[PDB]
Amino acid sequence: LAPSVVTGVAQSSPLTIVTNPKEPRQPVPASDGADYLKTIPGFAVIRNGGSNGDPVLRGMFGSRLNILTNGGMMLGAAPNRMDAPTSYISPETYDKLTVIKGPQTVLWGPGASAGTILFEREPERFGELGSRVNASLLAGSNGRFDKVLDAAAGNRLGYLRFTGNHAQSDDYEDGAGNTVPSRWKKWNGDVAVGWTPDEDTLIELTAGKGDGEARYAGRGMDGSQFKRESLGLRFVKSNVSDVLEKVEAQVYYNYADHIMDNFRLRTPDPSSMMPMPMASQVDRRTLGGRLAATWRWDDFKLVTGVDAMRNEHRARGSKYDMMTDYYTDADQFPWSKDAVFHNYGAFGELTWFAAERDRLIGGLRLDRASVKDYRQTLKGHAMANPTANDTRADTLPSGFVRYEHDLADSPTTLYAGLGHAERFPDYWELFSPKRGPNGSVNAFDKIKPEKTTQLDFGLQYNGDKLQAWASGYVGVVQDFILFSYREGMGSSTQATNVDARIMGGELGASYQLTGNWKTDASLAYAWGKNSSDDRALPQIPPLEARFGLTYEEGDWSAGSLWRVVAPQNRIARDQGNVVGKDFDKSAGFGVFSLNGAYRVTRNVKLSAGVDNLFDKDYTEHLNKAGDAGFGFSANETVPEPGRTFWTKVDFSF
Ligand SMILES: [Ag+]
Ligand SMILES: [Ag+]
Ligand SMILES: [Ag+]
């Protein structure tokens, strides 16, 4: 019952990881969504700067991960994901983070081939009229400073709840002593109003907003604005009848308003194809809802429902009077809508509790997706858009079966699962490519959906001294949406569909040596082949191992962590996604860290860490190339941080 610092999260039930994001984490997260996934084996991150990394799950990028917040979808607006969904999330302000690996759920929306990720806030439970507050402060190297506050008050009938944060850091340094362009700032504030007439009923209104900025070593431009607007309403009714156990309904609204320039957090590079000041503003408006019923009886549990989502993207840019010095900022022109998406779905999951050591789970969903290209003109001056105002649509079924078995002698679950997932192309796959497949007018017009078929299998072992887990996967992907970079100038990109094979897995254990000594370890491995061109997939994270050792004693704990990464020699030069491309094989490396925690009272607890103690100078295979306007040469990727120190206090009254 001593506190400690999180260095890895184990897989708790089959395919499933649940963690409390308010816990300290030993490579200290930069207050964004991707960094809180680093602690879960299977996840890697593309670094852009000091924050707003792009999460990669089992080597799978982008919307193949379905990342929800309170059930709703946040989508950003940069043409090259400079503002990925996770850049708007602050995990500390949530209560639960859940990951389901593989296409093994249909409850949370379309296209979740790689996995679904669920940041949740839980409704307040208030008996007598009262209040609660929990908060934290973090301080560290390079001006790192974080405030987080979560307060609520209410009684049996209802509650008001506020959660907020402010967080920042200056440019960090790499192990070689170089200052990396990488400073950032984020703030959020969210209210929830809860009404609970009887305990069978809950109705919750939520609203919030946030803003931020980020310097990006790995881009020619910086994020001067990350405006978020959020509205949500949720209704849960339990115990409707003897078989109807729950009914939940949900509506959300997320607006994202991103600015992107080369003069507010940097100087315009005179040597680049962009010597003059230049901003570009983009927005994303997402509206969606969910309606689900949960039926329970005998040895069965059936969950049925529908969902729908719409979203809209606009952009507008600055102009530079090149024969004067006059600059007209982007907000002096009207927005140009360029894309609208629609999806509607119906879904069900059935569970059979055969016997008591036996579970069978099946799910199915049918999705109707559609998109309309609203670009009247394109990009090199302006030119005609050959698909102006065209629509296209498709109907996509997905589902899975999964069998779980509990052994009698020893506490072990074995599971295997077959799943099939179909994903409509997202905004970036249809609008961002400069070119589509060969002989197409553009990407919007031809890029096919992506269809994944995958076998998932693994085990859970829950002893008293030894907890172990493992999940492996083999799958094929039809019409994998691939980017190829055809620099030669600037860099032009082409979207194509290819066939792919994928395999890999994660495994981990945590063994209690004595009352005071705990040890754990994990390993994550992804692998991919372009079957169409007979060559590796690009942008695949290399093999990864974590080794932790912890000593607990009464009210305090001290731990050490080794992270060890193989080189990546399977690469696909000038291929990748909307954000990055492979170019060179990566070096293996090792990073070491230390941490401690101390509980000073039932209300106050302390934490501290040294990240990368030996000031190792390294980079990750997935990080972006650093920009020529900063110090970087060709394909030199962004380095990770050198030694950083952090300390943190947690309050809970
Ligand atoms: Ag951008
Ligand atoms: Ag620019
Ligand atoms: Ag320009």
Residue numbers in the entry: 66 to 444, 449 to 557, 559 to 723
Paper passage:
Here, we show that Pseudomonas aeruginosa OprC is an outer membrane, TonB-dependent transporter that is conserved in many Proteobacteria and which mediates acquisition of both reduced and oxidised ionic copper via an unprecedented CxxxM-HxM metal binding site. As indicated by the successful structure solution, OprC contains a single bound copper and shows the typical fold of a TBDT, with a large 22-stranded β-barrel occluded by an N-terminal approximately 15 kDa plug domain that, like in other TBDTs, completely occludes the lumen of the barrel. The copper binding site comprises residues Cys143 and Met147 in the plug domain and His323 and Met325 in the barrel wall. The CxxxM-HxM configuration, which coordinates the copper in a tetrahedral manner, is highly unusual and has, to our knowledge, not been observed before in copper homeostasis proteins.
Since Cu(II) prefers histidine nitrogen as ligands and Cu(II) binding sites often contain one or more His residues, we also cocrystallised the H323A mutant with Cu(II) and Ag(I). With Ag(I), 2 clear anomalous peaks are observed, suggesting that the H323A mutant can still bind Cu(I) at the principal site and at the methionine track. All 4 residues in the OprC binding site contribute to copper binding, but not to the same extent and, in some cases, not equally for both copper redox states. By contrast, removal of His323 still allows Cu(II) and Cu(I) binding.
